[PDB]
Amino acid sequence: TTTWIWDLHADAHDFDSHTTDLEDISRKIFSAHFGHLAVIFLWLSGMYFHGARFSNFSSWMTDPIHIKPSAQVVWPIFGQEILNADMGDGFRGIQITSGLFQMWRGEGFTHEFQLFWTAIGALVMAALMMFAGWFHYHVRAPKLDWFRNWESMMNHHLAGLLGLGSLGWAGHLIHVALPTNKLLDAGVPLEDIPLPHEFILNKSLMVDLYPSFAEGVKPFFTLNWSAYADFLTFKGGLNPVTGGLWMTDIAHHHVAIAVLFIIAGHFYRTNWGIGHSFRELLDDARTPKMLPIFNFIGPVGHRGLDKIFETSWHANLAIHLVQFGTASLLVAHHMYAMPPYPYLATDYATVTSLFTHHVWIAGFCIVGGAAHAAIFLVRDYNPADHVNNVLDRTLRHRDTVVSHLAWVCQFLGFHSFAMYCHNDTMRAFGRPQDMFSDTGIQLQPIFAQWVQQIQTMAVGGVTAPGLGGPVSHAFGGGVVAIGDKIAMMPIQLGTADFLIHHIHAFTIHVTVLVLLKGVLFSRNSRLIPDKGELGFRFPCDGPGRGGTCQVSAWDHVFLGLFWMYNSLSIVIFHFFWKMQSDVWGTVGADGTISHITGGNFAQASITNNGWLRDFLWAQASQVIGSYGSALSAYGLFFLAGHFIFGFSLMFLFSGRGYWQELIESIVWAHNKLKITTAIQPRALSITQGRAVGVAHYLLGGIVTTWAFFLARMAAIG
Template identity: 70%
Template sequence: MIDRQRTNHNEKIHFFGSSLNLLLAGLFVCVVRKEEDLMIIRSPEPEVKILVDRDPIKTSFEQWAKPGHFSRTIAKGPDTTTWIWNLHADAHDFDSHTSDLEEISRKVFSAHFGQLSIIFLWLSGMYFHGARFSNYEAWLSDPTHIGPSAQVVWPIVGQEILNGDVGGGFRGIQITSGFFQIWRASGITSELQLYCTAIGALIFASLMLFAGWFHYHKAAPKLAWFQDVESMLNHHLAGLLGLGSLSWAGHQIHVSLPINKFLDAGVDPKEIPLPHEFILNRDLLAQLYPSFNEGATPFFTLNWSKYADFLTFRGGLDPITGGLWLSDTAHHHLAIAILFLIAGHMYKTNWGIGHSLKDILEAHKGPFTGQGHKGLYEIFTTSWHAQLSLNLAMLGSLTIIVAHHMYSMPPYPYLATDYGTQLSLFTHHMWIGGFLIVGAAAQCSHFLS
């Protein structure tokens, strides 16, 4: 009797245990099914890519203080004077430091920021000379009779004989760089503004130095980042060219145009409102360009012709200044900003839509060369010499085009009548274009060797 009760009791436990297992199994299947259903309708989680290495290389002042630390041979010290020349020749010859493409890429990327820092420093010097040693304000009052000068030779052993009368009672060396003309075109009306811009350029030079250190020693991009050409194209087109052009167009519209309108009318530069007044006070701008009264309404209602008072398409040259109409150039920069912003969204990155450079190159079939572009993608993503060669050739050609256009269509006020500056700018851009194309051939030979 007891055994039968125990057996029944065990069967009940077994039954409840089996039922519980079945219930749990059923719940599990339901959860899995539900999870599968959710996985079907849920958008995939974005793939997080770590594209930088943190703190890859220690910052070492002791290493920097040792001449030639980048080369075992040079680091041994000088044997002959050749050591000095090798020190300078090899400091940035990154190919001789290492054969690791990622490390070379990081060094080149970091060096770019150093180069930008030097450019900002140079620009700061130009603006400082304009503020401290020039006759800019006098030239602004009479640009046809007073020559631009931003350098006065000190009277040391008779060297002051180099100074000449440039007009307006100012004695100095006449400059032919075109800076005065571009300053007027951008709406600079005082030497104080030149000082402020010079200080701003110094701040940016410091930021670039910091960025160069940061992106080599603290957060260095991986090789995959340098080889992600679609993302690079998108950012360079939309960011540098698109937003850069849009920023300049905004400056031209809100600052340059109203200030130049006053200058062309003969208003004393000291009487012209300051740039921030035009930006903050719309009524002030609306007195010169009535469409500003309507704000952004014409833009959103597609009634864009309302803005024709400051976004013009006149063509030709302004008869007062001899330069392109500044309202035409503002319109031009706004138009190319829109084009580049659109172009910066053309290439396939994270969303699976857009162009792929590799596909474009490999799909191309020329009438004579056939699949001549096949393999180019691999070349340009593994050889920076090949890529730089192509870029230099195109930039050099563009620079020569700029040389010809700057005298046929002078872009800045009173540039056309400053013949020395016209000749200098043409010669400068022709030489620079030639050097860039020679550099393209040199880089190509590096790639081929």
């Protein structure tokens, strides 16, 4: 039947679904990770090759204020060469929003052969990854005690991967990227920029940019580190030429975290007696050894948990996908407010796209962390290992956890969203004094305003005397302007910011509620006492007990994907409106700031009608008025994303029993004309129809926001 075709592509990469031997499972995982590294190196080879061959990068490096970055040219077939837009400088292409040019300028790239030899090195190292995956599987695969050496793996990845990676990048910053960006910010044209090996061969050429280099590596070994305080600086603020962070703060950052990570890579005991072991740290976290505030975790505590990490790859994937969500969320929030690349903060199409991308990467990773947490509890969890420890006691009060979470989701939905419905009703009545607003009933976010005042008072310098400028200009300080364009200014928080932050707290808590109830009730419940015996992924247990549709832990990941999408859409909508309204814009010749949407977030974002009219209706005029221009691919992708959203609701709202009885009549008509095939035509399964419906829903909604974000910012940003 046709179900075998869909089941084969779904049974592809789960390895314990075959014969479960952990050493052979761990070897297929270790060599597939080499293959995914070869895919990343092949994709990195493309971005450096298209940056070296199909770009305006040498033209953009002359004057990065008035030149738009392009790195994709389009062939002249079917009339599709209209998308090759003028970027300035006579170059016709597609305006890229990834920010590769701002990344390459800060790293020290100056020509299009340096990007070429980086593309060759990524093409070489991709072939080295698909040899190491062949060698460490088909020739000399390791065995299970090598995979179980946590203390050696933690020591080698803290000190060796992160410590030597950022120390080695601090070598590239100090000897290549600090002189190249110091000459560029002091206005030196690119014929006169020395090639980056001449800052090492001609050592005297770095002496006049940094006089501490004449005194050599000798103050480092004698701990006279204050001699170096002109290329490793604790400045803060932004560069007034580029808008990026100070490159001497970036170098001293990657020096200080290098020492902190190499120190961290000596914490664990491997072969020499010195260090902590993972088992002794976990077997001691229990009563009576903990604090008396934590007496509730009981006498076993964390004692049975090391057998999880001995046996379960899914449980480690659950933690690591969560922390890649934590890292990518930090990358989103910290790179808009402390922009680390030159001429990044005033490229508004790039700041929009970089925040939105790394928010969405983080939200899929968090759902995957909850998905593979439920796979561990169904497949890998053995209850004999966990008697009265913190895993067993969590499963024994799951009714208190879910019902307390269900209450706080209802509290947050009333006391965030229903206050917008209060505000919609009060404004329609003509009672603006009765609204939750800065001019009505104020809800000042006083704890976030207090932190902003602390973050400003810290630099001067009550608690951090070492800075000159602020950590970020979003906290306080002043307006940074690059090319009469705002790079970063203080972001004022009012009643509109109190309300949208409690919307975020509401939509995250519900997304936790869908995912945590799926994990905590994955093995059994009061409804299905043998739910773990039915598997991780199954449609239901029949129409009985009232109806048991979507009880499986897979279907909670299915519902959690919609709620993650609903949560992160409001997050990027909060970002896109507030940056256009209160941050981005133009410093006039008068001295006054005229923002993009003119400061309308404080009064219009407090109702649903203002989000519909002033955000959704007003700002989508660029994407719907793009037909017959160079932004017309965004206008086509805008309607294409609307199509797949409506198309997804056929799979989500219907069931396969209709479609199987519809197929028998078309099977009948194919049999009357004698053209039957052997593989028998089946409707999709109940889980396949849910997986297709959620994939097309998320694809339809994200492509629509992507076309709306990028058509507006490529026109007016």
